[PDB]
Amino acid sequence: DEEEARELEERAREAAKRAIEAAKRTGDPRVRELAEELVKLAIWAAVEVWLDPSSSDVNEALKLIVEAIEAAVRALEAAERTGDPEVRELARELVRLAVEAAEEVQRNPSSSDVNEALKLIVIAIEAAVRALEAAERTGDPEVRELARELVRLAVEAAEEVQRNPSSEEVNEALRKIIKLILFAVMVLELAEEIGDPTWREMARRAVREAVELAEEVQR
Amino acid sequence: DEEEARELEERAREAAKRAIEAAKRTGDPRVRELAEELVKLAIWAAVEVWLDPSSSDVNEALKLIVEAIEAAVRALEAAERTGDPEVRELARELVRLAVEAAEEVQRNPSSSDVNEALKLIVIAIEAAVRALEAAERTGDPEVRELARELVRLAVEAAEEVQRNPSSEEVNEALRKIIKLILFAVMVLELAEEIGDPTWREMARRAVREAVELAEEVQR
Amino acid sequence: DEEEARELEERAREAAKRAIEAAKRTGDPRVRELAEELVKLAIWAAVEVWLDPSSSDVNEALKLIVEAIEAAVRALEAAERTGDPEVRELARELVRLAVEAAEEVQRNPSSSDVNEALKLIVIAIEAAVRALEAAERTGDPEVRELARELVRLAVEAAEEVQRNPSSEEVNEALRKIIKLILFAVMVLELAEEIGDPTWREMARRAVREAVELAEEVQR
Amino acid sequence: DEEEARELEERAREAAKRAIEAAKRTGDPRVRELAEELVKLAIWAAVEVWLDPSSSDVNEALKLIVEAIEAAVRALEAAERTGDPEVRELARELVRLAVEAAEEVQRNPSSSDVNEALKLIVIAIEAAVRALEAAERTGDPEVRELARELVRLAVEAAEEVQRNPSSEEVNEALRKIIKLILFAVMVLELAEEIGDPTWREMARRAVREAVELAEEVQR
Amino acid sequence: DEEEARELEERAREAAKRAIEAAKRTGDPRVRELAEELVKLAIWAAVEVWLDPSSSDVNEALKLIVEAIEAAVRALEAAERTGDPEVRELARELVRLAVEAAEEVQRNPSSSDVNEALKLIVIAIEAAVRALEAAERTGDPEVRELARELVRLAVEAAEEVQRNPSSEEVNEALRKIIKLILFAVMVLELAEEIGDPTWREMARRAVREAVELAEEVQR
Amino acid sequence: DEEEARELEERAREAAKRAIEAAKRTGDPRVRELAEELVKLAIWAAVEVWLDPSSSDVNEALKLIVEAIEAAVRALEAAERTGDPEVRELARELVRLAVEAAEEVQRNPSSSDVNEALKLIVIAIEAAVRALEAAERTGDPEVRELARELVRLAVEAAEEVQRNPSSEEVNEALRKIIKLILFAVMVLELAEEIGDPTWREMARRAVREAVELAEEVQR
């Protein structure tokens, strides 16, 4: 499968290049260390993919990893694009969660629960970046505070799923949280597409239910 | 199956957008609440489809659901397009039946009888909307009263199938009812295509048999 | 198999439309009742095909049925096209046999013998219509009386196969009859293609053998 | 397999048409009776193919039969094209052997030995017609007498294989005879392609061996 | 597999035609007898292929045989093209070995060892013809004497493999001989492509090792 | 699989031709002997591939071998292209390791460990040539000394894997070494693509860790 191999490889290279560009752009020591901790596992992906072609477990690990990296760099980029301190530190810790999970993957390529944990975290990151993009496109204060709210939700849920791979019940609660966050961001996108704030209020109801849930999920 | 995944997803998005457009158009609190109760399960479809790609039961549930939604929005739309109070409230309760069944689906993705119940209700809704379109195209009073008649039949049959998923005998009677309704609407379409009222009288005979049946099916 | 589904559906619709056109054209109460008894099972085919897609027994029943209908409408059409009373009543009872068999099918979708009986009757009808078309193209008196003769044979054979699905021996005799009729109509077509009456005399010998056989097949 | 069905059917029709054309052309009562005995089984092929589509044994019988017919009509045609009495009666009895074998096939569609017997006879007929065509193209007296010789061989071998389907030893001897005849006609074609009579003498040696063999094969 | 059948058949015909052309060209009684002994088995290939299509053992025998024939005619052709007596008689006995092996094949179509023996001999013949072509293209005396040398090797190895199909040890020694000959001719072709005699000396070393081996392989 | 066969064959021929060109270009007795020891196994690959087509183990051995050869000739070429004595002797012994492993392969086509050893050595060679190309493109002194460093690493690792095919622990340590070398060369390429020396310092850290590891791997 040299075609898929080279495809994944170029994806990894593109991820790393975009990460390094963003890091140079920000001129921030923290973002710098983050981008380095990211490009490292990107290049390690490339190496592992190379040495042993046509091996399915390894290939599966590699594709999911490079996907996570694309997500995280999108997140870092849009974060600095917004420029708001609160959301900036939020997304920074978010991408940190991403790279920590990916590191746990690179240490263990056949532990199912950590694979699924990275999956969930990738989804949460895509959710947060969708929300931030929507907020930027509308440029609406209430939309912005709601985006901060659900990004808080996303980072807290990802933190919790990162802490313990175990605990069925906590796992299901976190899965439901992620579902609610995705729901909120989708309905926000739709409300933006029609330009109606009433469904934005519906979304506010949805995320209010979500955060009330997450509160008890903390314990 | 990312191709089918994205296809279903865009279908769900298009359904929700058309629903919201119709709701804004009508400016009716009732239709508003209906469209909201609809777009909710549409977006929930999108989320569930996303989180777990390539899982067949979930995919099967999602496609059938978005089909039901397309049907219901067509129904709501053509209903307000006609403007007649009787048929308007009729189609409104019809789409309510649709969304209640779909909700029961979203609560349970592997109960066969409720899957088949939604199937039947979708069919009945397609039947009713076909009848209303035919009536609109001909613009004939007798055609209109017959359309009201078989729409009454459709809503009553759907109500009954919604009430109990069980009871083989009631199930078969309702299935036969739906078959007769489809038969009537097809033969009406044909009579419209040739412009002959004699086969409209044949259709009247058919639906008369159908409603006489449904009467005893009530008990 | 939505492609084959829609194909069969449009075939059924086209059959019904052509039937209704022919019935309007003839202005004959008998042909009218026949066309109605036909369009009914055509539309019932459409309904049954719809409700349960991708179910093989039902699909098999539907395709064979719509084929029978195409055959019968061709037969009714060419019959009134010829205008001769004898052959007209003949073909009328022929299409009646067709629709009676099709009705027996719609009542029972998994009885093999009646499936095969409809098959044979469809074949006989195609044979008769081929013979009538050939006679019309040549416009030859002897050809016309021979066509009447073998159409008599066809209607009698179809009547007998309709009477009893059972009785191996009568079944084989009727099958041989149908084979001989097809043979006669083919060799007549060929003789027409070359314009030689000598092979028409050979065909006369063939059908003479056929009718002598059918005589004892009556008992 | 409607495509292959219609293909075989048109092949049968074309065979019969060419046969009838040739028969009309010759104006010979004998050739007339032959062409009739041929077109009969051609049309019977068409019928049997029709009634029971997608049945492999029947299909296999039909294709082989129509192939035999194409061969025999080619043989009858080229025979009358040459005009020499000896070879004319020879090829006439040849095609008679062909149609007798084909009749035995139409009576029994699953007797292997008669299938193989028709196969061998078809091959022998193709051989004889190849030889006659080659002789016609060269227009050489010695070539013509050699063609008469190996056609005698072919008709005698076909007669013998027609007599008894059994007798392994006689079967193998006849198979070897057919092989030698094919060999002779091929090497004659080649010698014709280069225009060298020396290899014609080699072919004469080959057929001399062949006929010496056939002599003892008679007993 | 009528496509592959006709392909093999035309290949056989082309082989025979080229052989006969070469034989006519040389005007040599010996080459004449050789070409005849060749065209015979070519045409016999065609016959056997014909009578029993889609039979794998026979097909396998036929393709390998026609390949051997193509090789041998190439060899005879290039031999007379060179015009040197020594190599001429050499290649003549070479093609004689080829046709003797092919005859043994036509007598026995399922003896594995003789199949492999023909395989090896075909390879050796391709080797010799490659060497002769290379020598002709360079037109170098030392290249010519080396070509004579390795052609001697090839004919001796082929003679030995023809003598006994058995004897694992002699078989492996002959296989190694053929490998060394192929190696020498390839490295000679390469040296010719770059125009460097140093690798020609390397090739001389290779073939010297080869012939020293073959010496003891004689006993 | 004649297509893949001819593909591999032409690959082998192209490898040998490029090798001989490079050897002629350098005019160095050592490089000359190396290129000869290389072209020998290239041509032996071609022979073995030829004699036994469609045999998977042999085919697998052949493709991997010709890949190794392409790598080694690239290495020899770029080495003489750089012109630095240290790296020149380094790459020379490198390609010597390559050809020794390939020879061990040609002696044994089904020993797994030596297959994997050649695999690793091929990877290391591709790594070294990537590093040398990168250094040439940047033309940076520090880059050049780092390239010399990791090439030392590569040659030492390849030497060790060549020594013993056994010893799981030494095998895993060498595999990790190769991974680190690939990592370093990739991150160097990236740093070159962006023109930033900071990630070059990161690469220096990586290779420093690598060489500290290799030190203890020596014992």
PDB file of C-alpha atoms in Angstrom, chain B residues 24-176:
ATOM      1  CA  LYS B  24     -39.551  31.338   9.383  1.00  0.00           C
ATOM      2  CA  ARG B  25     -41.871  31.610   6.384  1.00  0.00           C
ATOM      3  CA  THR B  26     -45.064  30.586   8.169  1.00  0.00           C
ATOM      4  CA  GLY B  27     -44.639  32.796  11.232  1.00  0.00           C
ATOM      5  CA  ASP B  28     -46.737  30.342  13.260  1.00  0.00           C
ATOM      6  CA  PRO B  29     -45.828  29.435  16.874  1.00  0.00           C
ATOM      7  CA  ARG B  30     -47.066  25.869  16.399  1.00  0.00           C
ATOM      8  CA  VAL B  31     -45.103  25.262  13.194  1.00  0.00           C
ATOM      9  CA  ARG B  32     -42.170  26.891  14.976  1.00  0.00           C
ATOM     10  CA  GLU B  33     -42.228  24.411  17.853  1.00  0.00           C
ATOM     11  CA  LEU B  34     -42.625  21.586  15.339  1.00  0.00           C
ATOM     12  CA  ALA B  35     -39.647  22.680  13.251  1.00  0.00           C
ATOM     13  CA  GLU B  36     -37.562  22.929  16.411  1.00  0.00           C
ATOM     14  CA  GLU B  37     -38.552  19.457  17.606  1.00  0.00           C
ATOM     15  CA  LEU B  38     -37.520  18.319  14.115  1.00  0.00           C
ATOM     16  CA  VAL B  39     -34.179  20.101  13.653  1.00  0.00           C
ATOM     17  CA  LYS B  40     -33.173  18.777  17.062  1.00  0.00           C
ATOM     18  CA  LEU B  41     -33.300  15.143  15.984  1.00  0.00           C
ATOM     19  CA  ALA B  42     -31.782  16.055  12.621  1.00  0.00           C
ATOM     20  CA  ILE B  43     -28.701  17.494  14.330  1.00  0.00           C
ATOM     21  CA  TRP B  44     -28.629  14.600  16.770  1.00  0.00           C
ATOM     22  CA  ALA B  45     -28.557  12.334  13.744  1.00  0.00           C
ATOM     23  CA  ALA B  46     -25.530  14.201  12.433  1.00  0.00           C
ATOM     24  CA  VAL B  47     -23.736  13.862  15.752  1.00  0.00           C
ATOM     25  CA  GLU B  48     -24.393  10.160  16.238  1.00  0.00           C
ATOM     26  CA  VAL B  49     -23.364   9.479  12.609  1.00  0.00           C
ATOM     27  CA  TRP B  50     -20.130  11.335  13.168  1.00  0.00           C
ATOM     28  CA  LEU B  51     -18.863   9.848  16.408  1.00  0.00           C
ATOM     29  CA  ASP B  52     -18.978   6.189  15.234  1.00  0.00           C
ATOM     30  CA  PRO B  53     -18.417   5.852  11.480  1.00  0.00           C
ATOM     31  CA  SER B  54     -18.709   2.501   9.674  1.00  0.00           C
ATOM     32  CA  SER B  55     -21.087   1.034  12.279  1.00  0.00           C
ATOM     33  CA  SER B  56     -24.024  -0.529  10.426  1.00  0.00           C
ATOM     34  CA  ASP B  57     -26.887  -0.413  12.931  1.00  0.00           C
ATOM     35  CA  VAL B  58     -26.248   3.257  13.620  1.00  0.00           C
ATOM     36  CA  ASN B  59     -25.910   4.031   9.925  1.00  0.00           C
ATOM     37  CA  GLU B  60     -29.162   2.237   9.188  1.00  0.00           C
ATOM     38  CA  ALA B  61     -30.941   4.218  11.874  1.00  0.00           C
ATOM     39  CA  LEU B  62     -29.521   7.499  10.574  1.00  0.00           C
ATOM     40  CA  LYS B  63     -30.521   7.096   6.928  1.00  0.00           C
ATOM     41  CA  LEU B  64     -34.073   6.054   7.738  1.00  0.00           C
ATOM     42  CA  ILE B  65     -34.374   8.994  10.158  1.00  0.00           C
ATOM     43  CA  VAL B  66     -33.181  11.635   7.698  1.00  0.00           C
ATOM     44  CA  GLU B  67     -35.565  10.130   5.148  1.00  0.00           C
ATOM     45  CA  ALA B  68     -38.431  10.563   7.602  1.00  0.00           C
ATOM     46  CA  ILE B  69     -37.371  14.172   8.125  1.00  0.00           C
ATOM     47  CA  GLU B  70     -37.296  14.935   4.401  1.00  0.00           C
ATOM     48  CA  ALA B  71     -40.791  13.481   4.173  1.00  0.00           C
ATOM     49  CA  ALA B  72     -42.116  15.494   7.113  1.00  0.00           C
ATOM     50  CA  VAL B  73     -40.716  18.810   5.909  1.00  0.00           C
ATOM     51  CA  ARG B  74     -42.194  18.188   2.460  1.00  0.00           C
ATOM     52  CA  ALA B  75     -45.484  17.535   4.226  1.00  0.00           C
ATOM     53  CA  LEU B  76     -45.388  20.684   6.364  1.00  0.00           C
ATOM     54  CA  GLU B  77     -44.412  22.759   3.361  1.00  0.00           C
ATOM     55  CA  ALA B  78     -47.124  21.544   0.994  1.00  0.00           C
ATOM     56  CA  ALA B  79     -49.658  21.803   3.825  1.00  0.00           C
ATOM     57  CA  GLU B  80     -49.049  25.505   4.381  1.00  0.00           C
ATOM     58  CA  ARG B  81     -48.875  25.808   0.590  1.00  0.00           C
ATOM     59  CA  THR B  82     -52.489  24.642   0.337  1.00  0.00           C
ATOM     60  CA  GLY B  83     -53.764  26.919   3.111  1.00  0.00           C
ATOM     61  CA  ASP B  84     -56.901  24.937   4.011  1.00  0.00           C
ATOM     62  CA  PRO B  85     -57.455  24.760   7.807  1.00  0.00           C
ATOM     63  CA  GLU B  86     -58.684  21.152   7.977  1.00  0.00           C
ATOM     64  CA  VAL B  87     -55.816  19.644   5.981  1.00  0.00           C
ATOM     65  CA  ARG B  88     -53.409  22.049   7.690  1.00  0.00           C
ATOM     66  CA  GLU B  89     -54.086  20.777  11.203  1.00  0.00           C
ATOM     67  CA  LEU B  90     -54.171  17.267   9.745  1.00  0.00           C
ATOM     68  CA  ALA B  91     -50.680  17.456   8.248  1.00  0.00           C
ATOM     69  CA  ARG B  92     -49.463  19.192  11.401  1.00  0.00           C
ATOM     70  CA  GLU B  93     -50.467  16.268  13.594  1.00  0.00           C
ATOM     71  CA  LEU B  94     -49.052  14.008  10.879  1.00  0.00           C
ATOM     72  CA  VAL B  95     -45.562  15.478  11.133  1.00  0.00           C
ATOM     73  CA  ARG B  96     -45.963  15.338  14.910  1.00  0.00           C
ATOM     74  CA  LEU B  97     -46.500  11.585  14.620  1.00  0.00           C
ATOM     75  CA  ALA B  98     -43.399  11.422  12.440  1.00  0.00           C
ATOM     76  CA  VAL B  99     -41.172  13.214  14.939  1.00  0.00           C
ATOM     77  CA  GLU B 100     -42.538  11.215  17.874  1.00  0.00           C
ATOM     78  CA  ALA B 101     -41.655   7.979  16.086  1.00  0.00           C
ATOM     79  CA  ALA B 102     -38.222   9.354  15.211  1.00  0.00           C
ATOM     80  CA  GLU B 103     -37.665  10.279  18.857  1.00  0.00           C
ATOM     81  CA  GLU B 104     -38.559   6.740  19.885  1.00  0.00           C
ATOM     82  CA  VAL B 105     -35.937   5.628  17.361  1.00  0.00           C
ATOM     83  CA  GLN B 106     -33.244   7.926  18.744  1.00  0.00           C
ATOM     84  CA  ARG B 107     -33.951   6.499  22.189  1.00  0.00           C
ATOM     85  CA  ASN B 108     -33.712   2.908  20.900  1.00  0.00           C
ATOM     86  CA  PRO B 109     -31.630   2.109  17.788  1.00  0.00           C
ATOM     87  CA  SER B 110     -32.238  -1.658  17.662  1.00  0.00           C
ATOM     88  CA  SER B 111     -35.965  -2.210  18.338  1.00  0.00           C
ATOM     89  CA  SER B 112     -37.242  -3.695  15.087  1.00  0.00           C
ATOM     90  CA  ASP B 113     -40.958  -2.977  15.480  1.00  0.00           C
ATOM     91  CA  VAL B 114     -40.454   0.762  15.943  1.00  0.00           C
ATOM     92  CA  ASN B 115     -38.155   0.802  12.908  1.00  0.00           C
ATOM     93  CA  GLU B 116     -40.943  -0.766  10.863  1.00  0.00           C
ATOM     94  CA  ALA B 117     -43.486   1.601  12.412  1.00  0.00           C
ATOM     95  CA  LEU B 118     -41.463   4.605  11.287  1.00  0.00           C
ATOM     96  CA  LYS B 119     -41.158   2.944   7.881  1.00  0.00           C
ATOM     97  CA  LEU B 120     -44.932   2.668   7.557  1.00  0.00           C
ATOM     98  CA  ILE B 121     -45.449   6.227   8.787  1.00  0.00           C
ATOM     99  CA  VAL B 122     -42.915   7.573   6.275  1.00  0.00           C
ATOM    100  CA  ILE B 123     -44.785   5.731   3.544  1.00  0.00           C
ATOM    101  CA  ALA B 124     -48.109   7.168   4.689  1.00  0.00           C
ATOM    102  CA  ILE B 125     -46.624  10.667   4.718  1.00  0.00           C
ATOM    103  CA  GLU B 126     -45.252  10.284   1.198  1.00  0.00           C
ATOM    104  CA  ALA B 127     -48.732   9.123   0.215  1.00  0.00           C
ATOM    105  CA  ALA B 128     -50.456  12.135   1.753  1.00  0.00           C
ATOM    106  CA  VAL B 129     -48.031  14.589   0.163  1.00  0.00           C
ATOM    107  CA  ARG B 130     -48.469  12.909  -3.219  1.00  0.00           C
ATOM    108  CA  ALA B 131     -52.228  13.296  -2.856  1.00  0.00           C
ATOM    109  CA  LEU B 132     -51.960  16.962  -1.890  1.00  0.00           C
ATOM    110  CA  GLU B 133     -49.620  17.701  -4.798  1.00  0.00           C
ATOM    111  CA  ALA B 134     -51.990  15.966  -7.212  1.00  0.00           C
ATOM    112  CA  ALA B 135     -54.946  17.941  -5.861  1.00  0.00           C
ATOM    113  CA  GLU B 136     -52.999  21.187  -6.210  1.00  0.00           C
ATOM    114  CA  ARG B 137     -52.036  20.374  -9.794  1.00  0.00           C
ATOM    115  CA  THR B 138     -55.597  19.571 -10.843  1.00  0.00           C
ATOM    116  CA  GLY B 139     -57.318  22.189  -8.681  1.00  0.00           C
ATOM    117  CA  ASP B 140     -60.544  20.130  -8.585  1.00  0.00           C
ATOM    118  CA  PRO B 141     -63.050  20.344  -5.696  1.00  0.00           C
ATOM    119  CA  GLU B 142     -63.952  16.643  -5.676  1.00  0.00           C
ATOM    120  CA  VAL B 143     -60.248  15.811  -5.858  1.00  0.00           C
ATOM    121  CA  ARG B 144     -59.711  18.082  -2.858  1.00  0.00           C
ATOM    122  CA  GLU B 145     -62.395  16.466  -0.706  1.00  0.00           C
ATOM    123  CA  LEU B 146     -61.042  13.042  -1.638  1.00  0.00           C
ATOM    124  CA  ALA B 147     -57.552  14.201  -0.674  1.00  0.00           C
ATOM    125  CA  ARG B 148     -58.871  15.355   2.695  1.00  0.00           C
ATOM    126  CA  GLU B 149     -60.553  11.965   3.063  1.00  0.00           C
ATOM    127  CA  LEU B 150     -57.489   9.833   2.415  1.00  0.00           C
ATOM    128  CA  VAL B 151     -55.326  12.186   4.482  1.00  0.00           C
ATOM    129  CA  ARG B 152     -57.730  11.557   7.357  1.00  0.00           C
ATOM    130  CA  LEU B 153     -57.197   7.867   6.654  1.00  0.00           C
ATOM    131  CA  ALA B 154     -53.420   8.309   6.673  1.00  0.00           C
ATOM    132  CA  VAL B 155     -53.314  10.239   9.940  1.00  0.00           C
ATOM    133  CA  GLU B 156     -55.632   7.755  11.648  1.00  0.00           C
ATOM    134  CA  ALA B 157     -53.608   4.767  10.439  1.00  0.00           C
ATOM    135  CA  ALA B 158     -50.354   6.398  11.518  1.00  0.00           C
ATOM    136  CA  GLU B 159     -51.851   7.243  14.909  1.00  0.00           C
ATOM    137  CA  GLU B 160     -52.872   3.625  15.388  1.00  0.00           C
ATOM    138  CA  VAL B 161     -49.492   2.202  14.357  1.00  0.00           C
ATOM    139  CA  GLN B 162     -47.824   4.709  16.670  1.00  0.00           C
ATOM    140  CA  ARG B 163     -49.979   3.666  19.621  1.00  0.00           C
ATOM    141  CA  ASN B 164     -48.975  -0.011  19.730  1.00  0.00           C
ATOM    142  CA  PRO B 165     -45.945  -1.584  18.017  1.00  0.00           C
ATOM    143  CA  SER B 166     -47.425  -4.992  18.923  1.00  0.00           C
ATOM    144  CA  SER B 167     -50.592  -6.878  17.945  1.00  0.00           C
ATOM    145  CA  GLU B 168     -49.933  -8.786  14.696  1.00  0.00           C
ATOM    146  CA  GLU B 169     -53.576  -8.494  13.621  1.00  0.00           C
ATOM    147  CA  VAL B 170     -53.830  -4.741  14.116  1.00  0.00           C
ATOM    148  CA  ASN B 171     -50.428  -4.477  12.425  1.00  0.00           C
ATOM    149  CA  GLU B 172     -51.609  -6.368   9.341  1.00  0.00           C
ATOM    150  CA  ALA B 173     -54.826  -4.350   9.182  1.00  0.00           C
ATOM    151  CA  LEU B 174     -52.857  -1.097   9.302  1.00  0.00           C
ATOM    152  CA  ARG B 175     -50.450  -2.363   6.651  1.00  0.00           C
ATOM    153  CA  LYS B 176     -53.393  -3.135   4.379  1.00  0.00           C
TER     154      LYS B 176
END
